[PDB]
Design a binder for this molecule. Sequence first.
Ligand SMILES: CC(C)(COP(=O)(O)OP(=O)(O)OC[C@H]1O[C@@H](n2cnc3c(N)ncnc32)[C@H](O)[C@@H]1OP(=O)(O)O)[C@@H](O)C(=O)NCCC(=O)NCCSC(=O)C[C@@](O)(CC(=O)O)C(=O)O
Ligand SMILES: CC(C)(COP(=O)(O)OP(=O)(O)OC[C@H]1O[C@@H](n2cnc3c(N)ncnc32)[C@H](O)[C@@H]1OP(=O)(O)O)[C@@H](O)C(=O)NCCC(=O)NCCS
Ligand SMILES: Nc1ncnc2c1ncn2[C@@H]1O[C@H](COP(=O)(O)OP(=O)(O)O)[C@@H](O)[C@H]1O
Lengths: 92, 1032
Amino acid sequence: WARELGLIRKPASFMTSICDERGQELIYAGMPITEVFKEEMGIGGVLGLLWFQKRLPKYSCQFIEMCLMVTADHGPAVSGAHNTIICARAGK
Amino acid sequence: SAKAISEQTGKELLYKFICTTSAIQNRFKYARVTPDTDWARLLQDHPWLLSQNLVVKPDQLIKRRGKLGLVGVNLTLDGVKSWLKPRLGQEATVGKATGFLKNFLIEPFVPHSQAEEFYVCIYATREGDYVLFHHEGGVDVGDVDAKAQKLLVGVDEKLNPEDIKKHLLVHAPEDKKEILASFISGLFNFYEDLYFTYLEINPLVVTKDGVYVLDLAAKVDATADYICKVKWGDIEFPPPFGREAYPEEAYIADLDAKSGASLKLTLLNPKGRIWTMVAGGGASVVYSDTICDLGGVNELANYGEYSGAPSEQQTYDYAKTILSLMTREKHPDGKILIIGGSIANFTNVAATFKGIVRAIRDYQGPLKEHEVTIFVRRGGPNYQEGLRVMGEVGKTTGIPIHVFGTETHMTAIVGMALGHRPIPGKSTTLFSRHTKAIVWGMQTRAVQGMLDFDYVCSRDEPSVAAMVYPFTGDHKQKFYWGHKEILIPVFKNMADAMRKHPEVDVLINFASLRSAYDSTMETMNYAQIRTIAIIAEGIPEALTRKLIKKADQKGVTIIGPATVGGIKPGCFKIGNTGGMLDNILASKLYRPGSVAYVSRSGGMSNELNNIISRTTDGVYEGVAIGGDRYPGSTFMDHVLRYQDTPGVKMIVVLGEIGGTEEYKICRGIKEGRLTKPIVCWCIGTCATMFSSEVQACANQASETAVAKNQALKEAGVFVPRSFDELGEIIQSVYEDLVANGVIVPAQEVPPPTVPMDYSWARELGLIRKPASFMTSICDERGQELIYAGMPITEVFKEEMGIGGVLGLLWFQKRLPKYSCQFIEMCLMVTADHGPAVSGAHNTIICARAGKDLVSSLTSGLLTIGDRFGGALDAAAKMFSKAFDSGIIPMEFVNKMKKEGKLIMGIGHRVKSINNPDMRVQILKDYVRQHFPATPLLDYALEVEKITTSKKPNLILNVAGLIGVAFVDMLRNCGSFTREEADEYIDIGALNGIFVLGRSMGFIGHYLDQKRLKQGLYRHPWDDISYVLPEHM
Ligand SMILES: CC(C)(COP(=O)(O)OP(=O)(O)OC[C@H]1O[C@@H](n2cnc3c(N)ncnc32)[C@H](O)[C@@H]1OP(=O)(O)O)[C@@H](O)C(=O)NCCC(=O)NCCSC(=O)C[C@@](O)(CC(=O)O)C(=O)O
Ligand SMILES: CC(C)(COP(=O)(O)OP(=O)(O)OC[C@H]1O[C@@H](n2cnc3c(N)ncnc32)[C@H](O)[C@@H]1OP(=O)(O)O)[C@@H](O)C(=O)NCCC(=O)NCCS
Ligand SMILES: Nc1ncnc2c1ncn2[C@@H]1O[C@H](COP(=O)(O)OP(=O)(O)O)[C@@H](O)[C@H]1O
């Protein structure tokens, strides 16, 4: 109630610029989620907004999605997949 | 600060570090005699004593010994022994100083005449060093400044030999012209390499055999210790010859070196009743002058100050010292304690007053019967809380306490105490509303005060454009612009800051004394900077002179070192000037006035702020030039600035003792250069009433405050009778200037408001904010680290180890010693179980991925759960459930069997009955020997008897034993109730036991893989069965 009246000063300990949860609509780097779906960006456009705070061109978003697709998996023999499998088999 | 060194120290250091082609004789050839020493050792370590004739003189900072007959010349060793006895340890009187003798110096006699009596002197001035050579030196020197040849060596200039030959060696004999010149040159190099400010050898006798230094008086720049501690060694600075220093006075001197605060105390007569403990050097001088003016010269005991923002503990030390020294006598007439000073800019009045509060709480006894009345007059940061704290405490203990704020005159409490009154090119404009400054250093409180002042001054933009901090990368610091949040850039380098902010014209330098010189030199390489404020106190005077010379060359105005800075109401504030925002509002420093002032002190400058606000329109501009011997800018510089400023109408000058600086004002007002009204008061008129040379020091006779005050008076300067009359004379001059009509006061526009700080509102208890976190295991804050209510020193004294610390941190209990030992054993046996298990395997994989200790250990730890590492918890829970349900072990075995469940904690791969686990055995033996009761362990052993009857290897596991024994420890040691033990089992304390134990092994595996330099692991394809679908 003192903050609402503007009677006290308290510095904010955190800064953020990628997502605005508060308010009527969710916002991804200045862009409403309804506008995100209307403009038909997919994972690539959302990633551009959340990682770079930019509205990337469509080919950039498509390329980002393609990069995610080609690195999705490379079999169970590599170190990370091996560790994940070990942990899953530990019932974890 | 120049400090005189002993003759012995001066000659020793001179012999050790002079470098000349001249043949200097009697190197390290001297003997020190003191009353409390033997003589046989003195004979044995100095074989030169009997080799030739001797001369003895007291080395106790006494001059004019020849005119006073205190030297025994041309008399042998038995002569010096006979001559010491009437004087060694006896009373002596030189002028007004009376003191005993503890120090004498012995040196071989030098046969010489008046034909080779040579006087050499080097002393420091603002513009450089003067060398004086008198050919007819010695006692017959007479007038030296007018007859001895004088030569100036400027700042950053060399003393070259031909300069000595012509401008210094006209009257020297030709045969001795040459080598002496070389010597003189080397002497100058000795003078400036060891940071001497005064160095006179008189007489210096030179003959064909060589040169001989018979005498030398030397003052060295003490603040240069950090440069010359290697060359000086353990240099000592003798006190002036006179009364012996008190142990408490030496204590105060020792306190002065503890931190950057200034902690001074000096005595004249402890039998006096007037006792002043005044904050701020200027305020202390003013209070002493005020008490001496109205009849307290003889009855005043002490003179001293505490400033530079001393802490609570240091204030305790100073206050308990002053009370202990005050209690030495009973004065029937009564005793007073005058405490306070001016409004502080930086000194936390709250802490410095809690210090005296808690120093007088314990000193009620030995002073209440002394009839001590305490008069306080303090202002500054958090003064409204400290004043009323001390009022509460004084009323609680009952001693006479009179609490006065800033609404009263600073020296009115003096009149109350003594009963005289009832007790109730360089620019003209440095700063504007568009001035942008760079702050050198990480001073966020000062920058925020600057910004708050800018906001309440209705400035368009903040006055701080950037900060420079070399120990961090470039980033942005979050500050407040009123209630809005703004970002101010912080740069590692000056160059980037000046590149990105060409509109900055001011540098505020918060570098320490060791960094200020280099910071300021680097700053003056950027022509955009026209004004530099240097805050640091303790810069050596020679470095300051180099700064002054470069600033004069570059046309840069320097607000000299050892200053709080200055304030231009409505436009700009330097650093911490004017204190917090409440002081800014109270003195109405948010809007321009018409009176411009200059002073040396910052506390006196804030007092002037308050006075001028109370009696006139307000302050137009105030500058504190600092307490150094060579300020970057002088009184007369700022007075000239003010005269050329159409905004100012009257000029207040607050001078001090020593220095002929106000006489430049007199020559400017006696002539028509300075036309505006000037109200000047010089503090320190009590310096004459001091029977010593206490250091800000008067050198000549016209540099006393009385002479300067009278000289300004006859010059046309409005000089009050005293400081107490300064407010009224300023008021009268302003009133006449407003009756004439040159001053037209403006309408009081209310300033913008700044929201209160959250932390300050919480301290006042004005707001409520629920804490979002709860904790009960560790208290980091406070003087000592606390583990669940137990201090860390007590943790180590009680000799608990890892087990006791774990008990404290996990259960908040002081466990018995066997419990802590058992916990340690459990950690030891679960430390590792080889590299084949899932967690160790994952940790090794992650280590071989070149990853990280934390990452690898964490990768291994994330496998801890049901199938791996969870058997401890599972066994404890299963056995506890069976035991608490009341079923017998056979019923438990059958019930587990028909539920399709294996008993957790039963079973080994190879080991069986007659082939025991042997770490189950260690723990079981310990538990049997030390635990008071083990019901669950007995139950589990019965279960194990049944299961090993089924087949031999169905023994109690390490997991089973640790689980049941941990339950037994929790609920059978006296620390827990049954509910607490059950809760700790339920929330996973045994999971924590396994995790903490196995972390040791996982870290060991990480380090092992790093040491073996194992490369990236890939699982072989032949060990993987690929069962992908045909086509999805
Ligand atoms: C000048 C300064 C800011 C200097 O600051 P500090 O020295 O504290 O801090 P630092 O800059 O960090 O220097 C420390 C050195 O240790 C180094 N260091 C740090 N951490 C290190 C690590 N981990 N490892 C290695 N090294 C490390 C660091 O690098 C530095 O090294 P170096 O550069 O070589 O020095 C301060 O001291 C001072 O003088 N005044 C404060 C400001 C002010 O407003 N004054 C006027 C007050 S008006 C007054 O007096 C009247 C009165 O009192 C009257 C009354 O009472 O009424 C009143 O109030 O009105
Ligand atoms: C990319 C790079 C590692 C190629 O390595 P390489 O030694 O030519 O081949 P590999 O390290 O994959 O292994 C070589 C053999 O092991 C086999 N092998 C690979 N994974 C295996 C597994 N899990 N089990 C059994 N065999 C395996 C391969 O089939 C190959 O068989 P071959 O001997 O019949 O040719 C090497 O060129 C390099 O270090 N480049 C640097 C750039 C870089 O690191 N790029 C990253 C790659 S995305
Ligand atoms: N080592 C010495 N050899 C010869 N004469 C000395 C020696 N020391 C002092 N004197 C005599 O003392 C006189 C100088 O006195 P000085 O000590 O300078 O007085 P003050 O102590 O007042 O400065 C000289 O005239 C000199 O004859």
